[PDB]
Design a protein around this nucleic acid. Structure first.
Lengths: 121, 198, 419, 67
DNA sequence: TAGGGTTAGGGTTAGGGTTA
């Protein structure tokens, strides 16, 4: 059995605020599909800032690509020497039309409740 | 167009005692030697064992019938029933895809068997037309009462590396049919045509 | 003392607790961690009591491996191939994307595959006289690998009962496909044919350099062993089955010569003279001009099995195992002292356990009041045992591999202009 | 319960039919079948673990034992 | 003389340790 997948907004993982080898699930919008090297570069906006996450895909071929669309990625993170941070994909589904603010508020509320229950112990 | 380019053995149940007569009648040469060795020594190694099991599965033998057949022919080999259940029936269960991954396996083709792993000492798998001595092949043909003209034709076909044509000639001689009329590619074809003749 | 199957499990637990060389074993498997998680993606297959078969047991780290080994206490240890994902989570990835990637090239030699030729023992029995068979087989295969292909690192392991295994562990070989390994095994195989075939060699006038080297390095051993020890040409049925290997044109003459002769030496000399006479008098014969050479190869060459090397996900016994029939521990065989390797002198599990008891007896008055961890205690434990030469040979091989890694990284530094 | 398979045939003449009385009670009386007089140390047919097709039926209790 | 019919209802158990 594997470890569970905790949610993480793109900008935190972009800054490397998670330990190496952790399992995380995040979101973003695809920007490029490097065919030969099996690499995916998705992007997510934050005000005037744009953040990039590198996704290895060696475990989900065959895989259709939808340029300029949202995605959900779940897997493990490995801190490479030069490439930086890349997530090893285990499941990679596509969702469209789902509004970000509801999701962001949802994880914020869940984190708040978890911390509140953590105040008794 | 892609669909067009993309390309585009279930005989009824049989008993457990007619196998000897069918073998003396319906087994092609590429497996008659294996059957004879199994009936003589009551023991066989992996290469012959999977081939024989796949063939018997492909000619209408149930899981229970095959289990009884294997347990009988291996009790004749002086084993222990507990050891049989632990090893041999245990292997046979996944040989038919009863449990485990259950990926059901199709029987080996004639071409694959002829071009399979070359048998060594202590092994009998493989068609005699490819992996047997000419003198032993002639002796075994004479044991099947093959006419001298048929023997010469079989030898010439073997020299020409036309093993399938030699199998066709053997089928025609044993079944007393002037022409087989069907190209041989798989032992299931041979057995089904023999059953149709019967 | 005679090994008994009713006393093994406690000795096995003690061995796994104390003497198993975990440090060196991990050092070999880890390969220095040049590739991320190379060791973490290995497949293991134990075999617990009551002959229950399990597999796909990865290990996160060396300490976890030690703990699981101590808890589980299995019988047989095996090594698989390296996959793209952790084997213990093989059901967590889509089917078809979990494929074997690399494994070490191996060969196997079965002593029992020579029954029709050998006569010293019967079935599963061994004698010191027949050990020369696998000795010369080892020499032939090792020389061929070292010279023809130039593979650097080799490690020979004695299985324990009747076999010896080859563990090629170089770098540019682990990445080979199945076809290349099949070609290797085909090129290294000469004894061809099934049960129905009598003659195992069909050689033309031309002789390959490999065959020439083999026949040159095989003469110095064939004479003594074959003529004196086994005495192939002793009885009537002996030369009766011998003459099946030669054309019938001289069968009666050779039979009469054998009848006249008294010992196998005279019969062999007469066979040599007759063969030499026939070579000068060759008249429309499909047979090769090397009757003596081909019979020596037929009764003397080793026999491999293509199935154990063709597969890439196949399994084979790991070294330092414990055979459940004789208790002899599988140990490496020194390359420079192969001729002085008696199979019967290899230490057994019962003898090594009594040695451990005597070691504790000595420790009762030699080593006292030590506040060390289990690492140093077990280090001195297997130092004091009879396995010291074997672990020393293993360490020397590991040092050779480490020196090779140092050389390759220095070459990479030279190429990359990083000094 | 065992079904008998005697010589197979058809006979249209007189057939005489008989039946024993209290077969199991007679067996118990003759051989002294009781919990306090029967031990379970054998290897006959019934009570053994699944190790093969052989198990344990208790043998005949000794008639010389206490009734 | 004022609601219909009013009825209590499914409420167990199933087995890892496997390859061509």
């Amino acid at each position: 059995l594997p470890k569970p997948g905790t949610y993480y907004l793109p900008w935190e993982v972009s800054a490397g605020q998670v330990p190496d080898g952790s399992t995380l699930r995040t979101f973003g919008r695809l920007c490029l599909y490097d065919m030969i090297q099996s690499r995916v570069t998705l992007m997510a906006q934050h005000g005037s800032d744009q953040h990039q996450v590198l996704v290895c895909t060696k475990l989900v071929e065959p895989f259709h690509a939808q340029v300029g669309s949202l995605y959900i990625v779940l897997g493990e993170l490995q801190h490479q020497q030069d490439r930086g941070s890349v997530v090893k994909a285990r499941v990679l589904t596509c969702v469209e039309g789902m509004n970000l603010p509801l999701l962001e508020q949802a994880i914020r509320e869940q984190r708040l409740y978890k911390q509140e229950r953590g105040g008794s112990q | 167009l892609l669909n067009h380019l993309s390309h585009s053995g279930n005989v009824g149940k049989i008993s457990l005692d007619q196998i000897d007569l069918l073998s003396t009648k319906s087994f092609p040469p590429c497996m008659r030697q294996l059957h004879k060795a199994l009936r003589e020594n009551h023991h066989l190694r992996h290469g012959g064992r999977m081939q024989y099991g796949l063939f018997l599965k492909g000619i209408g033998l149930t899981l229970e019938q095959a289990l009884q057949f294997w347990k009988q022919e291996f009790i004749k080999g002086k084993m222990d029933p507990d050891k049989f259940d632990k090893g041999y029936s245990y292997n046979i269960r996944h040989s038919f895809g009863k449990e485990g991954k259950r990926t059901d396996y199709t029987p080996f083709s004639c071409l694959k068997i002829i071009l399979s792993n070359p048998p060594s000492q202590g092994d009998y798998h493989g068609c005699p037309f490819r992996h047997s001595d000419p003198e032993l092949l002639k002796q075994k043909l004479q044991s099947y009462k093959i006419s001298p003209g048929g023997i010469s034709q079989i030898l010439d076909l073997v020299k020409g590396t036309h093993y399938q044509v030699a199998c066709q000639k053997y089928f025609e001689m044993i079944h007393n049919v002037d022409d087989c009329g069907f190209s041989l590619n798989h032992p299931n074809q041979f057995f089904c045509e023999s059953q149709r003749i019967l | 003392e005679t090994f008994d199957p009713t006393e093994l499990p406690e000795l096995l637990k003690l061995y796994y607790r104390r003497l198993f060389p975990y440090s060196q074993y991990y050092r070999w498997l880890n390969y220095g961690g040049v590739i991320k998680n190379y060791f973490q993606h290995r497949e293991f297959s134990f075999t617990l009591k009551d002959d229950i078969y399990i597999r796909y047991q990865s290990f996160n780290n060396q300490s976890d491996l030690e703990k699981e080994m101590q808890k589980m206490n299995p019988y047989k240890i095996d090594i698989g191939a390296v996959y793209s994902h952790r084997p213990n989570q093989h059901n967590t990835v889509k089917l078809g994307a979990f494929q074997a990637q690399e494994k070490e090239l191996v060969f196997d030699i079965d002593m029992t595959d020579y029954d029709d030729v050998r006569r010293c023992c019967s079935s599963a029995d061994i004698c010191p006289k027949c050990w020369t068979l696998m000795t010369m087989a080892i020499r032939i295969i090792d020389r061929a690998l070292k010279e023809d292909f130039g593979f650097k690192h080799r490690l020979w392991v004695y299985s324990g009962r009747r076999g010896v295994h080859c563990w090629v562990c170089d770098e540019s070989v682990r990445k080979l496909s199945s076809a290349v390994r099949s070609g290797i095994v085909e090129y290294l195989s000469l004894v061809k044919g099934g049960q129905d075939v009598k003659k195992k060699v069909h050689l033309s006038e031309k002789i390959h350099p490999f065959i020439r080297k083999s026949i040159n390095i095989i003469k110095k051993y064939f004479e003594e062993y074959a003529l004196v020890n086994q005495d192939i040409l002793e009885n009537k049925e002996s030369w009766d089955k011998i003459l099946a290997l030669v054309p019938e044109t001289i069968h009666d003459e050779l039979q009469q010569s054998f009848q006249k002769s008294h010992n196998s030496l005279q019969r062999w000399e007469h066979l040599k003279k007759v063969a030499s006479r026939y070579q000068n008098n060759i008249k429309n014969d499909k047979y090769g001009p090397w009757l003596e050479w081909e019979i020596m190869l037929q009764y003397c060459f080793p026999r491999l099995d293509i199935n154990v090397s063709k597969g890439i996900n196949h399994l084979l016994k790991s070294p330092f195992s414990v055979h459940p029939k004789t208790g002899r521990i599988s140990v490496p065989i020194d390359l420079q002292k192969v001729d002085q390797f008696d199979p019967f002198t290899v230490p057994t599990i019962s003898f090594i356990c009594r040695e451990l008891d005597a070691i504790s007896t000595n420790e009762e008055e030699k080593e006292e009041n030590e506040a060390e961890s289990d690492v140093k205690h077990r280090t001195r434990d297997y130092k004091k045992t009879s396995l010291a030469p074997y672990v020393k040979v293993f360490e020397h091989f590991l040092e050779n591999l480490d020196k090779s890694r140092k050389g390759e990284l220095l070459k990479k530094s030279d190429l990359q202009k990083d000094f | 319960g065992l079904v008998l398979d005697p010589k197979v045939g058809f006979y249209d003449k007189f057939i005489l039919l008989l039946d024993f009385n209290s077969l199991y009670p007679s067996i118990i009386q003759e051989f002294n079948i009781c919990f306090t007089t029967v031990q379970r140390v054998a290897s006959e047919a019934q009570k053994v673990t699944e190790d093969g097709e052989q198990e344990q039926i208790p043998e005949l209790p000794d008639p010389s034992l206490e009734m």
